[PDB]
């Protein structure tokens, strides 16, 4: 994206671009989330 | 394809201001006269 930061893409661009610009942010937020997740369930099963 | 409703909205404009009947657009005629929803789904006619 061209921009880490939603308020920068929502002020320069429109609503057409911009939601171009966020999905983007979006799809590589929650693949941050879904390794983390992972990683924290294959984690707890060393732990259990 | 069938369709629910269907309605012909028809009027007249400069041939610099079609540009203003897509949707989300900015200018006097998409603001002030004949907005279109950022979800339209449609088609846009224009003739000279």
Redesign the interface.
């Given at each position: 994206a061209i921009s880490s930061v939603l308020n920068d893409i929502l002020s320069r661009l429109d609503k057409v671009e911009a939601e171009v610009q966020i999905d983007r942010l979006i799809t590589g937020r929650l693949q941050s989330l879904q390794t983390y997740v992972t990683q924290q369930l294959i984690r707890a099963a060393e732990i259990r | 394809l069938c369709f629910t409703n269907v309605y012909a909205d028809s009027f007249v404009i400069r041939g610099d201001e079609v540009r203003q009947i897509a949707?989300?657009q900015?200018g006097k005629i998409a603001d002030y006269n004949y907005k279109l929803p950022?979800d339209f789904t449609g088609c846009v006619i224009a003739w000279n």
């Open positions: - | 949707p989300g900015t950022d």
